[PDB]
From a paper:
We studied one type III effector from plant pathogenic bacteria called Pseudomonas syringae. This effector, termed avirulence protein B (AvrB), is targeted to the inner face of the plant cell plasma membrane, where it interacts with a membrane-bound host protein called RIN4 (resistance to Pseudomonas maculicula protein–interacting protein). A crystal structure of free AvrB revealed that it adopts a novel bilobal fold with no structural homologies to previously characterized proteins or functional domains. The junction of the two lobes forms a large solvent-accessible cleft with a volume of over 900 Å3 that extends into the lower lobe to form a pocket rich in conserved residues. Our data significantly extend previous observations defining the key functional regions of the type III effector protein AvrB: its upper lobe and interlobal cleft mediate contact with the Arabidopsis target protein RIN4, and the lower lobe contains a pocket suitable for binding ADP or another similarly shaped molecule.
We therefore examined binding to nucleotides, including adenosine triphosphate (ATP), adenosine diphosphate (ADP), guanosine diphosphate, and nonhydrolyzable ATP and guanosine diphosphate analogs, by soaking these into AvrB crystals. We found that crystallized AvrB could bind ADP within the lower lobe pocket of the large cavity (referred to as the ADP pocket). Significant interactions with ADP involve AvrB residues Y65, R99, and R266. Y65 stacks below the adenine ring and hydrogen bonds to the 2-OH group of the ribose, while R99 and R266 form salt bridges with the alpha- and beta-phosphates, respectively. N62 and F113 also contact the adenine base and phosphates, respectively. The conserved AvrB residues Y131 and D297 located at the interlobe boundary are approximately 4 Å from ADP and appear to contact it only via bridging water molecules. Mutation of ADP-binding residues in AvrBY65A, AvrBR99A, and AvrBR266A resulted in complete loss of AvrB-induced RPM1 function. The requirement of ADP interacting residues for AvrB phosphorylation suggests that nucleotide binding by AvrB is critical for this event. By contrast, the important ADP-contacting residues Y65, R99, and R266 in the lower lobe pocket are conserved in all AvrB homologs, suggesting that nucleotide binding is a core function for this entire type III effector family. In the AvrB/ADP structure, we could not definitively observe a Mg2+ ion.
Numbering used by the authors: 16 to 53, 57 to 319
The structure:
């Protein structure tokens, strides 16, 4: 329909960021973690406020054909994210880089993720299973295996492991903490902590990134009802958060992208309800159920 000279791409004009804006109080909640087990310093509030401003700005770009692919949106999300990193940060590179096969893909379910232990144990789709470890030996774990449907191929995304033999673990740790030392232990425990999330294999990123581009293409249509629109946004958020494309910062980028797309359509999405951590809520569910409850995870609506 229209043509953007700057990027040399035709597009369909959309209603940029609405003029009605979230209350400055909610603006400072956008992109915040908000763990149910409890962190709102002037910094945390400024970080969120900034995410809010940049979200609407990228949404403005999208509505003008300035951003033309998901990959491009993810890039704007990454650059905003990197701007919040302290000068000379050694982690800077992890926040700017995509994840690969021989790299970190595990999140030990310790503080601040403690509240995930319950969600897994009580998960209607979790199944008892026996985990084999070179250290702890065999353990009884409640396991939730997140999967996705893609072109007829059902793939495994995130896997949650939660050891159930409490007493036995206390003793195993005590013994090991003396046979390997607090040091060697933490290293092995960085990848094999009884309670952990084994993230999506990086080998699936390419088809997932392509799928995210396909949802973006759909999401920027000018003839979508707000019901069809909200669904697409929830899906995009689901796939992005569950894929965890980058070595670091995926949840911020994922939420940023999802809200940038909504913002391009005028939708001013309020922050997530206290206790509702978007990426985790996504990793703990199937695509369809996540889309169904997306609205309820947000404040008003
Ligand atoms: N300074 C901060 N204040 C408030 N929330 C933050 C801050 N930094 C990051 N977050 C948020 O907390 C979550 C963790 O981000 P994520 O990128 O997945 O983490 P990491 O790669 O560091 O594990 C996201 O919801 C993110 O937007």
């Amino acid at each position: 329909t229209s043509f953007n000279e700057a990027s040399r791409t035709s597009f369909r004009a959309l209603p940029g960021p609405s003029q009605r804006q979230l209350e400055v109080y909610d603006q400072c909640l956008i992109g915040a973690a908000r763990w149910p087990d409890d962190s709102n310093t002037p910094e945390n509030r400024a970080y969120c406020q900034s995410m809010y401003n940049s979200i609407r700005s990228a949404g403005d770009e999208i509505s003008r054909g300035g951003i033309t692919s998901f990959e491009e949106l993810w890039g704007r999300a990454t650059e905003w994210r990197l701007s919040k990193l302290q000068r000379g940060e050694p982690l800077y590179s992890a926040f700017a880089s995509e994840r690969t096969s021989d790299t970190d893909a595990v999140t030990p379910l310790v503080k601040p993720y403690k509240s995930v232990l319950a969600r897994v144990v009580d998960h209607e789709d979790a199944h008892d299973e026996i985990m084999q470890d070179n250290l702890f030996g065999d353990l009884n774990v409640k396991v939730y295996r997140q999967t996705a449907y893609l072109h007829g191929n059902v793939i495994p995304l995130n896997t949650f492991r939660v050891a159930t033999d409490t007493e036995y673990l206390r003793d195993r740790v005590a013994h090991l903490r003396t046979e390997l030392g607090a040091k060697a232990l933490k290293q092995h425990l960085q990848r094999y902590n009884p309670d952990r999330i084994d993230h999506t294999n990086a080998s699936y990123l390419p088809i997932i990134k392509d799928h995210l581009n396909d949802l973006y293409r759909q999401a920027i249509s000018s003839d979508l009802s707000q019901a069809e629109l909200i669904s697409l946004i929830a899906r995009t958020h689901w796939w992005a958060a569950s894929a965890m494309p980058d070595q670091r910062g995926s949840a911020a980028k994922a939420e940023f992208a999802a809200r940038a797309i909504a913002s391009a359509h005028g939708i001013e999405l309020p922050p997530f309800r206290n206790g509702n951590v978007s990426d985790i809520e996504a990793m703990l569910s199937g695509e369809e159920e996540f889309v169904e409850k997306y609205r309820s995870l947000l404040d008003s609506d």
